Write an enzyme that holds these catalytic residues in place. Structure first.
Site, PDB file in Angstrom:
ATOM      1  N   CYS A 117      68.345 -23.749  58.683  1.00 34.18           N
ATOM      2  CA  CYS A 117      67.200 -24.360  58.024  1.00 34.18           C
ATOM      3  C   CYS A 117      67.118 -23.948  56.564  1.00 34.18           C
ATOM      4  CB  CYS A 117      65.899 -23.977  58.723  1.00 34.18           C
ATOM      5  SG  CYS A 117      65.852 -24.325  60.476  1.00 34.18           S
ATOM      6  N   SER A 118      66.761 -24.907  55.712  1.00 39.73           N
ATOM      7  CA  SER A 118      66.516 -24.621  54.311  1.00 39.73           C
ATOM      8  C   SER A 118      65.189 -23.888  54.130  1.00 39.73           C
ATOM      9  CB  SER A 118      66.496 -25.909  53.496  1.00 39.73           C
ATOM     10  OG  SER A 118      65.444 -26.754  53.921  1.00 39.73           O
ATOM     11  N   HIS A 143      65.558 -25.506  48.265  1.00 36.31           N
ATOM     12  CA  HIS A 143      64.968 -26.830  48.450  1.00 36.31           C
ATOM     13  C   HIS A 143      63.527 -26.813  47.942  1.00 36.31           C
ATOM     14  CE1 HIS A 143      63.932 -30.683  49.730  1.00 36.31           C
ATOM     15  NE2 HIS A 143      63.660 -30.451  51.001  1.00 36.31           N
ATOM     16  N   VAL A 196      61.587 -22.424  52.051  1.00 34.21           N
ATOM     17  CA  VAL A 196      60.552 -22.823  51.103  1.00 34.21           C
ATOM     18  C   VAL A 196      60.894 -22.237  49.743  1.00 34.21           C
ATOM     19  CG1 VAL A 196      58.917 -22.759  53.024  1.00 34.21           C
ATOM     20  CG2 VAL A 196      58.949 -20.861  51.373  1.00 34.21           C
ATOM     21  N   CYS A 228      60.083 -35.163  50.390  1.00 33.47           N
ATOM     22  CA  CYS A 228      61.214 -34.460  49.816  1.00 33.47           C
ATOM     23  C   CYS A 228      62.030 -35.333  48.872  1.00 33.47           C
ATOM     24  CB  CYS A 228      62.112 -33.934  50.935  1.00 33.47           C
ATOM     25  SG  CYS A 228      61.273 -33.517  52.437  1.00 33.47           S
ATOM     26  N   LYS A 265      70.266 -25.841  51.714  1.00 31.15           N
ATOM     27  CA  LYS A 265      70.158 -24.640  52.528  1.00 31.15           C
ATOM     28  C   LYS A 265      70.381 -23.385  51.697  1.00 31.15           C
ATOM     29  CE  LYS A 265      70.621 -21.292  55.344  1.00 31.15           C
ATOM     30  NZ  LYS A 265      69.484 -20.334  55.374  1.00 31.15           N
TER      31      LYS A 265
HETATM   32 NA    NA Z   1      67.729 -28.848  46.190  1.00 31.66          NA
END
Ligand code: NA
Ligand code: CL
Ligand code: CL
Ligand code: CL
Ligand code: K
Ligand code: K
Ligand code: K
Ligand code: K
Ligand code: K
Ligand code: MG
Ligand code: NA
Ligand code: ZN
Lengths: 128, 347, 392, 348, 347, 347
Positions: free
Chosen positions: C206-207, C336, C209, C85, C332
């Protein structure tokens, strides 16, 4: 295929390494001691599968493989000798807590589909 | 004091050449023939299976032993191709040789070492005085996956050995045995799948050679011997290349390893491979000859044997067909008829 | 050792972009960055890229060649940089150091991700964990950060309500971001009562996909004046990086990211400022807990107090005299896209410090003229910090 | 040249399922089945458990009781019907998991539910002949009964391991003799493609189970010169409770003699672990000097008979590992839906 | 009012002779050739399937129609070997010819009559004015069970027909259509099984002939015609024998039925059989020729058609490959390569 | 000139609540109920399949039509779960209603749009005058993969429609029809596999909504209408959420879309979904009511219909069971009995 074969003695028997120079036990076994690096001298070391829950989580939507297990407890166990490991815990969702004493157990962890190999390894069971 | 009182072999009559398989799949046959050191392989008749091959070998071993099969107190069949998933071949063989009912039996599984595992079991039961004679068989009707390289070597055959305690009837004597075993995922098959899977080049040095060579060294240490003490040798032979590499690694010459190598014209008969090669050695050996036999099974593990031939060998060799006579009585077939016989055409 | 500045920034929308291919994304982000910087394509001397989807999603490695080829910039050198990431920030730092060396004067640092094309995305984001000692045993990526939250709650007494306030703020801020994946307000109850992923985290912690692309144009501080008015230039005071154990269980303390402490301290030293002078911060909050921890590791509050500074809302834009965290909505709410996140973080600081109209509705107060960004790879194995200022 | 057991161990998983929960689904009277088969419930392995893990549990417990160094074990034999692989030996996985590797031989055994005891006889030979110092024989299974069929009420999971040795000081029990009866009988089988076995119904009874079990029993008693009165305890194969008791009463054993070996009514039929497990319960209760008759059965057809005498060392080791009764009684009940989920009985 | 504005065909290049199949299975090839009136059959390349064959045929029909595929308002594919169990071939074909997105489509199933069922659907949609042009395709990559008699006839091929309303564009005109349908278990396949099952001699008189002859007599009654009114005819052709028996029963001579019979050198292409035979007739027919076409499907059912050729036929015949040219552009293969291509080898 | 003369529906009696499936697989049932807008689904008896369901629906439609089934000139069954892989359902249905033999038939496949494809076909044949009456059926006994989210919605049901030409006999009139079709791999199944595969969130915007909204926009443009011109609407309903999102996107209110939505208590019956929803609209609708009906199938395509209800509706509604009565006559079962019925237990 080959990668399971290299760590079988670690996954099956919890055999790690102890650096004689500083005495710190390492599991999973390490090729190099991070604190002593070049001056470190590593020896084979048999751990007892005993430890305590350091932290944990409950996985509610895992990959399809784990459908039989869902929801399952995943945890980081602090072993008596010092090292910490990541593993599942065979207990009820509502009885896992930090500090609970646990002990390693030989279990079926993963399978590479219906044609590939079965991989065995450690899972932790509470003491009572 | 434990030895072999009789031995027997069986190979079916049909063969198929590398050229006939390569023709279909578009490969250079000469490159394969040279790469694997294989020319042709054996093929069972559609009315033949591991059981029938085991009975042929068992019956032939009884002829050489010259004993009453009622005297056999254990029958062990090592294979990868037991006709049933759950119903013992060993029982069918015992009935088919008249060994029933006063005996124990079991079907053995350990890839291509199953057959030699059974020999060791018989050695124990005879040596301990628990039985008077035990039979160990290794047989297979191997199946190679059609497009794969294993189709060039996967063949059918088997050999039986009767183990006994009486010096006067021993044709060969076990000097010692040793086994090397670890957990190695080089070759496997899951219950659902038709054909096995493997780790390609992982099947070589870390699996076959590790276990075959550690087992070979191991028994020579146990016995305090060197390569020069042995007249003949036979190793597991999935192809000709591996056999010779191992044999030359240990220091054996062509004269020492030649008799044990059957794959180039027989193919790899899996749990029957070393039993058959050993039997060809015995069909040629003379009194006093010392043999090193080392099998291999994926898994993994190897069984080593240190055997000396006696004067009784000349009495029994002609009591049954010789392994080389069976191998050379042959009928060739093409790939179409091959996949018909082997049940490789989906119906 | 030349000073490095930022002269342009471009970004796609972050979300489920079915229509937009991988090509459509990098182009749109690159052209926007080119256009903002007032440079021609020929002015770019090199490119540095972060991207995960290609190899896990499509089987495509050698992405750099692909991106240069289809951008039409052949023969400029293009290089891919990977740290899960944190690939975005590492691509930037790689670009920064290349300008500092004198080998290139104008360099594009971008990141792109196309995670919607894969059937199951988790296996890719799990690549950032130890496959043999974490993933193998069934520790999903959310469960790792969930175990961080558990330990933090055990040591410092963070309550789920305090943790959940992080997500409420993010979503409020994200309604002010046209490029945000989620543009809706939420409440504490909606966050806590959302479906659970890994105890104590919920889907609203949670972020997601995300597909998206972002790109920056970095330039020699002096040459920057050739393309931009001196007032619209933002200078990179520090581009630092650190490492930590890849596995969470090997961490000396799981409640902190040592690599963030190490990297942030070094940046603060090089810039010769203290945390108290940072006006805006963009932190890696893919799981909320990570947002609190980084607020502490960067030195904005004491270890264990992040929950109490979020509860009072000091990180909010309207709250004055305290640093403003993730004005865009963070990972979030804003989205992401693994490879572009590190780039986007800095582009927000760039917009925020230059008072660009792009962030007009979420503009933070700028007393001192400093911003900092923390990009994390995995659970903390890699951290990259970038400190920007309006003053050279 | 005496041969005996130096250590033994057992394992049973924690989940159970009652006859009532299976009959509910298929529309049968549970009481009729309970009485007809003499079975109340059976064991269920966790989806992360299989024959290998069950064998390892049993092996490790047997090592505890033996009190020896597993490096000394020169053979490991696993008898099963549910080896996790079709072509890759369980025994190797068990040897690595107990530290017996690499100086040993191994093999996987197949002969329906007698596979486990065949391995004991193999170990007896290798130790008695002096070829190895210690050998391990395991019998374990995670049986699967065909969903609509009667075998689903009994098909259970479990296993037990035995370490065979030569040293009187370390023997907890001594083999007095062994005998086996074997023929070719098509009472029960499975073909390679099929998921579940097939059988001959009422042919599985008198012409197969009783023929072999009873001929094996009277054979070893003739070999040994003994009568039913000479034995303190007995254990026969137990596909259901009814067959066990019929055989036990036919030979003249009383409840007190056959009581300990019968586990199926609350354990189910563990196939190649069935008799090994019952024998282990006898040993958890037995006193010095007790004489045991053990007779297994496997379809195909064959039986292994054993005549065993317990020694004074038994007391020292019983508490060194979990007792078979303790394992059997620490349990969690499940319903049919979760059972078929666990067992992989749902088409996916 | 309703007619065919364009038509097209496709046959793959590989063939296999009866001699090559019988050789493997131990049968007399001359008996089979005479019993079935079949010499060889077509074989699709391993990279070919019903979708690709349907696309080839569809694209050829567009060439002959000389229209813009965007105007096609329905695409129907009739088959037994749709490459997916659940994903429509017809959608792939529309995308491959540029007919998308303004159209309807469906995949058709009714044994070997699926292809002609689609023609009737298009006739309806064009006649009702709901669409301007419709496409009906019949295509298959049939697979015969190894060892069974259907392996001598089970082949691959297909043909497409575009239906239209414009007299200037019609190459042939539908005079009428009629269908006979009952529930007949002569031939079937269950979802799990690889190859179908059938009632052997029940497939003949009570099924094929009942339906083919009732459909033929029926349309002739509807049209008020006799056999003499027709210049050409084409019936379903699972083998040559059934075709000729039916044709001779109704009173057709060789000159009338010769063009429609392709099975002796093509094999039975199932839902493409009559569509292909019809196309060969159209490649030869002259203005004014009147055609009787009757399909058959197990199930069972038959679709009958009465068609008259127009003067436009000779403008379009050469605008695409002729069915006879496709049929004679061929490469021979043996049984081993055949089963390799067709996926008949277990793995 | 073209309309519906009769219609009928069928739903089996067994149901299973979300709670019984979630309980087994370890999921939060409330999250699912809210996420999918589904409470329970239908389950067929083990002696029920697509054929029996189609016969029930067809027979009910004949009651409402009040005609002699002998007059039906076409029977088309659209499904994803035809009981045979190769043997037409439609033939069995024709025999079971007495329509045989003077008719054509075909089985239709196009994921969940198969059923409405047959309506368009019947429209063409009746409008063209090729038949007097045609029957179009959509029915399925869907099966969701155990453990997957489709197991909460995959249900069984079907509905039949008889199309005719005579105003006096029409209960509803077709104003127009339109279809949007592309090649989209959102959902598919291969011949070997038991359960389908899908692209997860690719199934939403790029597939369902793309095709449903383009088709709905298309027919309204063809017809010159707005959302305000329609009294009722029904869209494909794989879950309640997609239906409502689509309905609200186009501007329909609850009162407009409420009747067509059955999935929350019926489940997704695939090719029977929209036919059943349309049938509930007709059980409630009054003279002059205008309906927008848009189906969806994966691969992919949608069929749109613009229908106006006539005065004859009240005469027939009670001539057969109402779709709400069938839906509310129910018996609940648990997961164990469900997988037993559906054949989901490996045996
Ligand atoms: Na971002
Ligand atoms: Cl090693
Ligand atoms: Cl440009
Ligand atoms: Cl379909
Ligand atoms: K086996
Ligand atoms: K600018
Ligand atoms: K007309
Ligand atoms: K089908
Ligand atoms: K009729
Ligand atoms: Mg410019
Ligand atoms: Na049952
Ligand atoms: Zn050290």
């Amino acid at each position: 295929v080959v990668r399971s074969w290299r760590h079988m003695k670690e996954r099956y028997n919890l055999i790690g390494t102890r650096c004689k120079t500083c005495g710190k036990v390492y599991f999973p076994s390490r090729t190099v001691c991070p604190d002593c690096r070049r001056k470190g001298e590593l020896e084979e070391f048999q751990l007892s599968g005993k430890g305590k829950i350091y932290t944990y989580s409950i996985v509610y939507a895992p990959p399809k493989e784990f459908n039989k297990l869902t929801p399952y407890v995943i945890a980081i166990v602090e072993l008596e000798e010092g090292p910490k490991v990541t593993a599942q815990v065979d207990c009820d969702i509502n009885k896992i807590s930090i500090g609970i004493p646990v002990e390693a157990a030989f279990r079926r962890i993963k399978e590479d589909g219906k044609d590939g190999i079965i991989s065995y390894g450690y899972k932790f069971v509470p003491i009572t | 004091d434990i030895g072999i009182v009789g031995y027997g072999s069986y190979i079916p009559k049909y063969r198929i050449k590398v050229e006939e398989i390569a023709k279909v799949w578009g490969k250079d046959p000469e490159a394969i023939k040279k790469g694997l050191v294989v020319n042709e392989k054996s093929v069972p008749s559609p009315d033949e299976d591991t059981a029938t091959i085991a009975v042929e070998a068992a019956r032939n071993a009884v002829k050489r032993a010259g004993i009453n099969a009622e005297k056999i107190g254990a029958v062990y069949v090592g294979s990868e191709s037991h006709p049933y998933a759950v119903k013992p071949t060993s029982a069918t063989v015992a009935e088919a040789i008249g060994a029933t009912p006063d005996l124990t039996a079991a079907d053995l599984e350990f890839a291509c070492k199953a057959g030699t595992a059974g020999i060791q079991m018989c050695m124990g039961l005879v040596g301990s005085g628990l039985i008077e004679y035990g039979m160990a068989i290794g047989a297979d009707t191997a199946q190679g996956a059609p497009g794969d390289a294993l189709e060039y070597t996967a063949s059918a055959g088997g050999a039986a050995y009767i183990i006994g305690n009486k010096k006067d009837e021993m044709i060969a004597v076990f000097n010692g045995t040793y086994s090397y075993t670890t957990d190695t995922p080089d070759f496997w098959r899951r219950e659902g799948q038709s054909y096995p899977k493997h780790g390609g080049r992982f099947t070589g040095e870390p699996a076959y050679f590790k276990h075959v060579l550690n087992a070979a060294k191991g028994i020579m240490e146990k016995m305090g011997t060197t390569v020069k003490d042995y007249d003949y040798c036979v190793f597991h032979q999935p192809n000709g290349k591996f056999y010779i590499k191992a044999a030359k690694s240990l220091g054996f010459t062509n004269e020492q390893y030649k008799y044990g190598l059957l794959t180039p014209y027989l193919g790899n008969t899996y749990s029957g491979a070393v039993p058959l090669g050993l039997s060809n050695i015995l069909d040629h050996a003379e009194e006093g000859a010392r043999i090193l036999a080392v099998s291999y099974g994926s898994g993994a593990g190897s069984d080593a044997f240190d055997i000396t031939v006696t004067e009784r060998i000349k009495e029994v060799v002609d009591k049954a067909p010789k392994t080389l006579d069976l191998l050379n009585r042959k009928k060739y077939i093409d790939y179409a008829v091959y996949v018909k016989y082997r049940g490789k055409i989906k119906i | 050792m030349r000073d490095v500045a930022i002269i342009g920034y471009g970004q796609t929308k972050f979300g489920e972009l079915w229509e937009d291919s991988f090509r459509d994304l990098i182009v749109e982000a690159g052209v926007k960055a080119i256009k903002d910087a007032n440079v021609d394509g020929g002015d770019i001397d090199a490119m540095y890229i972060g991207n995960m989807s290609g190899g896990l999603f499509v089987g495509q490695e050698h992405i750099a060649s692909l991106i240069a080829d289809h951008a039409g910039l052949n023969p400029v050198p293009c290089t891919r940089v990977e740290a899960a990431c944190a690939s975005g920030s590492l691509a930037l730092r790689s670009a920064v150091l290349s300008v500092a060396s004198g080998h290139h004067d104008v360099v594009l640092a971008g990141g792109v991700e196309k995670m919607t094309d894969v059937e199951d995305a988790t296996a890719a984001i799990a690549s950032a964990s130890d496959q043999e000692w974490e993933a193998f045993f069934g520790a999903t990526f959310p469960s790792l950060y969930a175990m961080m939250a558990r330990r933090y709650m055990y040591q410092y007494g963070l309550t789920i309500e305090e943790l959940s306030m992080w997500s409420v703020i993010a979503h409020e801020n994200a309604t002010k971001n046209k490029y945000a994946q989620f543009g809706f307000k939420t409440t504490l109850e909606q966050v806590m009562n959302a479906s659970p992923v890994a105890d104590p985290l919920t889907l609203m912690h949670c972020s997601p996909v995300s597909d998206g692309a972002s790109a920056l144009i970095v330039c020699d501080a002096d040459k920057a004046e050739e393309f931009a008015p001196k007032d619209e230039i933002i200078y990179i005071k520090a581009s630092t990086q650190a490492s930590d154990t890849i596995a969470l269980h090997d961490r000396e303390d799981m409640t902190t990211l040592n690599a963030a402490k190490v990297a942030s301290e070094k940046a603060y030293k090089l810039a010769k400022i203290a945390p108290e002078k940072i006006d805006v911060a963009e932190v890696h909050d893919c799981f909320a807990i990570n947002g609190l921890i980084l607020v502490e590791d960067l030195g904005f509050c004491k270890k264990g107090d992040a929950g109490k500074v979020i509860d009072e809302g000091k990180i909010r834009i309207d709250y004055d005299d305290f640093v403003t965290v993730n004005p865009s909505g963070g990972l979030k709410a804003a989205g992401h896209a693994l490879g572009a996140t590190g780039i986007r973080q800095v582009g927000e600081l760039y917009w925020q410090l230059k008072q660009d109209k792009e962030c007009k509705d979420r503009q933070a107060t700028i007393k001192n003229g400093y911003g900092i960004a923390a990009n994390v790879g995995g659970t903390g194995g890699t951290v990259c910090v970038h400190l920007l200022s309006d003053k050279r």
